Design a protein around this nucleic acid. Structure first.
Lengths: 56, 134, 233, 197, 171, 187
RNA sequence: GCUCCACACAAAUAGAUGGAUACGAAUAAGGCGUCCUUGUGGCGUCGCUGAACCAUAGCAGGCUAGCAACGGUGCACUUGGCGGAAAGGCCUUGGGUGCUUGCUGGCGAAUUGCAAUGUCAUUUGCGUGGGGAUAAAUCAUUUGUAUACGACUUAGA
RNA sequence: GCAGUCAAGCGUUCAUAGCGACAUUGCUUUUUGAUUCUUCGAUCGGCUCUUCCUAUCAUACCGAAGCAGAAUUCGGUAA
RNA sequence: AGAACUGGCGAUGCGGGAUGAACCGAACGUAGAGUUAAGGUGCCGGAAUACACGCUCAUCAGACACCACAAAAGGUGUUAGUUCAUCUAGACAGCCGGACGGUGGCCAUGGAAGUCGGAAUCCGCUAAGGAGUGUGUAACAACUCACCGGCCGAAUGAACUA
RNA sequence: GCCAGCAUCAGUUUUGGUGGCAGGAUAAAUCCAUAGGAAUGUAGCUUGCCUCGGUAAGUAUUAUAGCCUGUG
């Protein structure tokens, strides 16, 4: 005896409300927003000992 | 008779010297020899005899034949042509069933209506003798 | 990063040594070569640390260096070119397994007689036949298991019955706290090449009835710079 | 290129076969499917049984007699998969579905006829190896089809009769090919070879 | 599209006080000259103080591979400002041309990381002359002596709808 | 990462004969013969010379490689079973109620019959599988040995034995009655 | 009123316009031929789509004269066997009856006018005279094992 | 809930600003199972009869428990 | 929640989003031919079961997302990367052996010797061996790991990111 | 009067075949010659496993296969 299954149909009211939720959260995050280290010469690169030589 | 009898299951293998028939593209039905292997899907081929340019190609565009010949890895076009001629792969290909089927079908396509009539008459002539034999 | 076996970590005090220990042994053997006159190779495949400590305390003036075969091979020299002194790879090649490489300034014959007269008792060490034969009695087994009058010994501990039953393959039952069997289990016969579980049975019952006598293969003198081979046990 | 096309369902995938068949009927070709019990679905048995149970629990509540009718046979499963593609509520779709016939096993008159396949619906060609699949006779017998033991008993007879037929045809073909080989090398055959026959 | 390699040079515009400025050069992978020049200015704004109105391009040119039939093992440096501070990647590609290496690299990044053209930066593509400098195992797989392998599943493209054959996938 | 080809080796001693069409495997030796179907696996077989059979996988993943290794292990078990055999010794224990273990031949089917387990009148019947031979070990109290060439059938029958006599609704710390596998090995 | 044939006229229409041309099984494997130790065998060979195979000349296919072979095919009889999943079809024996483009000849076609799809593949209905044989149910009545009425269930020359 | 402590990480191109998971302290009244138990302003409940959910009270099968047995407690599948 | 522009609906049909006043495209006379927008091309359904590179198996996957909610992570499912380490003076995994000595260290207790507890936690000899990682004993014993060595013969481990 | 066919033209449009040219590193390449170099090491040679001639590690830079780089 297998049980129910949720539906994936989106019922337009929900996608309108989600758009509004996100449009509000974006403003709130923009408002809270008001309050490099270069990773180097990575290994496994075989010809890495040549980049050390263009310096001088 | 108490030795192991494991099967073989022969296969056309992707190897240098393996000759292949190009079934789609600009060449469209020409031969070439695999000279190098780029990955599981790509190889480098070269046919100077039939006139295909040396190129990288996916394996879906070609189809391996059972024929192969001696060829070093990463050969050039001239060495490819020399080994091609020395092995004489074109004659083996012409002798194979497969190429005969292709030649037969293009002949049938190039047949004229009058030749079609001739073929029908000849088939009737042959049918008489064969049914007599049976 | 997943579908691997997790390493069982535990939190103890000691920690691994690494390359520094090996370099230290290297420098020690190389500076002792220049110091002492004679150097010997001793094959010590299965030892007890108290026996090794007895051998060491027998002379505090002479040195004994254990360690890794391949490290001592490099310190001496395995090639005739790569070598510390002359005709030395001729000695370095003799090393077979667990080698205790000894340095001394003492006479050849004292060492030669000491390491053949020295003999101790030890376990039978599997892959080596034992000069003994043991049927366990068919009643209750005791801690020595058929070596002395049972009126001296006590029955072994009940906690060993899973071990005896599973790992040693002995047929075993227990009536109350005592372990018991129905028939006399024979474990070994003299001149029988021993296996792991037979050795563990004899160890559990406490049987050191094998002759440990250290083997010496070769010998090298610095002033002469020559090798000399003498298999003496 | 024929008046009627007989399709052996063995080794095929239900949805792809349904699609090609539907688009053929709507174009006007008459098609007859056989051996639906040997049909295949992608995914493991458990998944598709769960799916059929999901379909089977659906039913009109105030009267079960007027709800989705859950047909258990493989032919009817295939018919459902197909009818869901066709606009069966139109006269055009009705006329299309009336060009179709689905059978469990190969009954007469189609046993004495040629069958074909659809290579863009075969399991062995479409699926990647190392992938679980499901077969429809097993599924239908799980969900209550009480006839899989008769169809096997009958196919075991059909196959024997067909083997006799093939053993006769194969010797006849040997005779014919030998006579043709003997007739070969004649100038008529050389001319035919030149002209491509 | 199918990329091309473009040489680009920029002059930042002369002044009195400074005739003949320093002519910075770059190599770009891109479909066409418009995109190449936009990328040129995009990198030059990061490196130095220049602007499309404050500067000019001198010589756009194309670079074709010297040996576009010789098979090669390329090593590529890549970086992408995500999600943290920028972090680098080294990849290896067996191919004939830098263009093909870059194309299959962009496709592989889009597949395996959902990282995009806008997100990606090409530092350096470099042919590896000597074997035993090849580090990655999936490229090491293909350098072995007298390499052979089959294709055991053949499936044949069919032009028709129906077939009378019960087809076979052999080789 | 789609390993281009992976291989495993299978050693065949002299008395053994191995026959392999598509993925069916027949192994014949002194103790008997064995058959096994491996069509679910999608690997490739090949022979080198009468003592070494290789199994190969082309362009496969982790699960495929695991399938290769376990195929090797299965064939090795077949060879060991046809050469030496498999022998499992089980012991049955009781505290108060002597468990009576016998054999019965019912419609020619070889059932093992267990009686009086923990003082019940139910008679527990275990069917013996084909290729398995039961004997009651002499001069060893309450031990039974299962011998054969199929390790699968032997071990599964022993498991059926030790499962049919499980204790129910009682502290197993106290109630030790049951049938247990004492030893596994060869003949 | 029904019934077999010696058929004037009506009928072919979810869509004829050469032929729906029969092994099973597998696909990290198979088909065909051949040999022998009969097997999970040896050898050879094939695929790489039906782009095949078979039919296919004659006025929508005529009227005739021959050559060579005893083959091919149609129509109606005729022998025997098989087939029950929805068998309704498959094969076979014989003798008739025509045709044969396997090969060589002789006559006719025309005006459908420069194309018009240019029509070609059962019977019920009335001539047909084949032309003889002679059942039920329902209503009404009745029964009550049934029943709102219908229905159901029984009986009655 | 309030106010705090700590610290795995995050950390204006900050080492000594800030944020901060998991843990954790205080307040709630008391230490000797005497607590006499003691209610303090809301703008519904009851018949017939059917079905459904599981977030299972009982029945069925299992797991872990100082589970001797007996009974019981916790939990898994299960409507 | 308040104010300030802007755009649209209200007054507005058309194509698409399965359907929809305010979303995408695009604004309207009646017809014909061609090309497109947005959206789409397995069948319903007009249009590639097209080509190419990868990834993914979900015991009710997914088929526009939004560090918009469930939200902060968890997982021995998978793939690709980054950093740090070990390694022919032999790494990882397996087996085998060693795993000591002062010492049964001091308090405590009916007893506790590395392992009920409190607090020291040192030196020696070593290749290495904790005043001891766990099982266990009334206490010892025995086993075990931590650490070292022998056999094996080439790659391996951990932490992170996506 | 009604429905149609064809030829040659005009306007709008769609879809094929073919030719001549200009550029770019005056494409790069391929190809030819030449100087070096090396390995996923060709021939030859050395020592061995050694199942009748296949073999492992050492040598040797084109030899009785070739490849790479530069220059022209």
């Amino acid at each position: 005896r297998v049980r129910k299954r949720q539906s994936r149909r989106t019922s337009t009211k929900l996608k309108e409300g989600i758009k509004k939720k996100a449009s509000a959260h974006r403003k709130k995050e923009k408002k809270m927003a008001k309050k490099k280290k270069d990773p180097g010469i990575p290994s496994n690169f075989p010809y890495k000992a040549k980049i050390l030589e263009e310096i001088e | 008779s108490t030795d192991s009898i494991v099967k073989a299951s022969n296969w056309r293998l992707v190897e240098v010297g393996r000759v292949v028939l190009i079934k789609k593209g600009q060449s469209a039905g020409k031969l070439a020899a695999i000279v190098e292997i780029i990955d599981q899907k790509k190889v480098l081929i070269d046919g100077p005899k039939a006139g295909v340019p040396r190129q990288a190609i996916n394996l879906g565009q070609v189809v391996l034949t059972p024929l192969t010949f001696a060829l070093p890895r990463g050969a050039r076009t001239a060495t490819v042509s020399k080994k091609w001629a020395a092995a004489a792969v074109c004659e083996k290909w012409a002798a194979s069933s497969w190429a005969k089927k292709i030649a037969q079908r293009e002949r049938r396509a190039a047949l004229t209506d009058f030749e079609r009539f001739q073929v029908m008459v000849l088939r009737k002539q042959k049918r008489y003798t064969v049914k007599k034999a049976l | 990063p997943r579908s691997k076996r997790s390493k069982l970590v535990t939190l103890a005090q000691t920690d691994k040594k690494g390359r520094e220990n090996k370099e230290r042994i290297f420098d020690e053997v190389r500076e002792a070569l220049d110091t002492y006159r004679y150097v010997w190779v001793l094959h010590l495949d299965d030892v007890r640390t108290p026996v090794l400590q007895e051998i060491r305390t027998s002379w505090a003036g002479s040195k004994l260096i254990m360690g890794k075969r391949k490290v001592l091979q490099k310190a001496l020299g395995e090639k005739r070119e790569e070598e510390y002194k002359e005709n030395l790879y001729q000695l370095s090649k003799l090393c077979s397994g667990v080698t205790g490489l000894l340095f001394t300034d003492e006479d050849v014959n004292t060492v030669k007689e000491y390491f053949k007269s020295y003999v101790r008792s030890d376990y039978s060490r599997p892959n080596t036949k034992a000069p003994l034969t043991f049927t366990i009695p068919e009643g209750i087994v005791y801690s020595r298991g058929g070596q002395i009058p049972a009126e001296e010994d006590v029955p072994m501990i009940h906690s060993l019955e899973p071990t005896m039953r599973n790992k040693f393959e002995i047929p075993t039952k227990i009536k109350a706290g005592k372990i018991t069997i129905d028939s006399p289990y024979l474990v070994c016969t003299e001149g029988e090449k021993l296996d792991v579980r037979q050795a563990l049975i004899l160890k559990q019952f406490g049987i050191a009835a094998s002759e440990f006598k250290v083997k010496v293969s070769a010998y090298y003198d610095n002033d002469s710079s020559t090798v000399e081979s003498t298999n003496i046990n | 290129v024929e008046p009627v096309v007989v399709i052996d369902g063995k080794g095929h995938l239900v949805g792809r076969l349904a699609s090609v068949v539907a688009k053929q009927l709507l174009n006007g070709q008459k098609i007859v499917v056989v051996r639906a019990e040997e049909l295949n679905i992608s995914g493991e048995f458990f998944r598709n049984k769960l799916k059929y149970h999901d379909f089977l629990r659906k039913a009109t509540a105030f009267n079960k007699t007027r709800g989705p009718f859950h047909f258990r046979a493989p032919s009817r499963i295939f018919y459902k998969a197909l009818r869901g593609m066709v606009s069966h509520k139109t006269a055009r779709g009705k006329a299309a579905l009336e060009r179709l016939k689905v059978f469990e096993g190969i009954p007469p008159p189609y046993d004495k006829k040629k069958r074909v396949v659809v290579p863009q619906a075969l399991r062995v060609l479409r699926l990647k190896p190392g992938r679980k699949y499901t077969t429809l006779g097993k599924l239908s017998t799980s969900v209550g089809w009480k006839y899989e033991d008769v169809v096997a008993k009958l196919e075991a007879k059909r196959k024997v009769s067909s083997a006799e037929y093939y053993a006769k045809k194969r010797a006849f073909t040997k005779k014919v090919a030998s006579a043709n080989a003997t007739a070969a090398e004649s100038d008529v055959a050389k001319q035919l070879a030149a002209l491509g026959y | 599209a199918h990329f091309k390699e473009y040489q680009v040079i920029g002059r930042r515009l002369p002044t009195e006080s400074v005739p003949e400025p320093k002519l910075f050069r770059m190599r770009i992978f891109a479909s066409n000259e418009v995109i190449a020049k936009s990328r040129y200015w995009y990198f030059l704004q990061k490196l130095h103080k220049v602007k499309k109105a404050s500067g000019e391009i001198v010589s756009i040119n194309q670079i074709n591979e010297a040996h576009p039939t010789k098979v090669k093992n390329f090593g590529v440096w890549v970086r992408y400002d995500s999600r943290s501070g920028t972090h680098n990647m080294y990849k290896e590609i067996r191919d004939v041309s830098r263009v093909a290496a870059v194309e299959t690299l962009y496709q592989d990044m889009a597949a395996r990381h959902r990282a995009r053209f806008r997100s990606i930066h090409i530092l350096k593509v470099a042919e590896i002359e000597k074997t035993a400098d090849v580090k990655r195992q999936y490229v090491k797989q293909f350098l072995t002596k007298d390499l052979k392998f089959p294709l055991p599943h053949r499936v044949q493209k069919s032009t028709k709808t129906f077939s009378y054959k019960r087809p076979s996938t052999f080789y | 990462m789609k390993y281009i080809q992976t291989e495993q080796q299978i050693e065949v001693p002299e008395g053994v004969t191995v026959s392999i069409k598509s993925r069916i495997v027949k192994v014949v030796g002194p103790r008997g013969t064995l058959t096994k179907n491996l069509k679910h696996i999608d690997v490739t077989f090949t022979k080198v010379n009468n003592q070494l059979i290789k199994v190969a996988v082309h362009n496969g993943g982790r699960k495929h490689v695991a399938a290769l290794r376990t195929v090797k292990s299965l064939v090795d078990n077949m060879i060991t079973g046809v050469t030496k055999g498999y022998k499992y010794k089980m012991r049955y224990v009781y505290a108060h109620f002597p468990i009576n273990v016998n054999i019965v031949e019912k419609d020619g089917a070889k059932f093992i019959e267990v009686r009086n387990f923990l003082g019940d009148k139910k008679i527990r019947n275990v069917p013996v599988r084909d290729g398995v031979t039961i004997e009651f070990s002499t001069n060893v109290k309450d031990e039974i040995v299962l011998s054969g060439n199929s390790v699968e059938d032997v071990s599964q029958n022993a498991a059926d034995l030790q499962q049919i006599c499980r204790v129910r609704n009682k502290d197993i710390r106290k109630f030790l009655d049951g049938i247990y596998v004492s030893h596994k090995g060869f003949i």
